[PDB]
Amino acid sequence: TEADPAILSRRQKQIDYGKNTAATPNKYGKYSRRAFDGMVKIWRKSM
RNA sequence: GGCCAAAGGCCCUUUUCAGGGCCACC
Ligand SMILES: [Ca+2]
Ligand SMILES: [Ca+2]
């Protein structure tokens, strides 16, 4: 599990953006940047 | 434990069903 406050807060932000839409990746997980970015993309559609 | 999803490493953006950058892999 991830603990770095910069990674957590950015991940939380991508999520916030998501559950702010009209219409889910675990932020506490160990993942490369491309990996987490990939899941958020897919998840954002749709959602 | 592993079985699937995502995934080169890292970074920026509400163009966010998306756009962009560094580095590496000739
Ligand atoms: Ca795959
Ligand atoms: Ca990897």
Q: What is the Cα–Cα distance from A4 to A43, expressed in whole angstroms?
A: 23
- A34 in contact with nucleic chain B (CB within 7 A): yes
Domains in chain A: boundaries: 1-46
Ligand 1 centroid from CA A36, angstroms: 13
Sole residue written with tokens 């999520």: A15
Name residue A29's amino acid.
G
Which method, experimentally, gave rise to this model?
X-ray
Q: What is the Cα–Cα distance from A29 to A26, expressed in whole angstroms?
A: 6
- A44 in contact with nucleic chain B (CB within 7 A): yes
Nearest to A17 by CA among A33, A4, A28, A47: A47
Q: What is the Cα–Cα distance from A16 to A20, expressed in whole angstroms?
A: 6
- A8 in contact with nucleic chain B (CB within 7 A): no
Burial A13-36 (b: 16+ CB within 10 A, else e): ebbeeeeeeeeebebeeebeeeeb
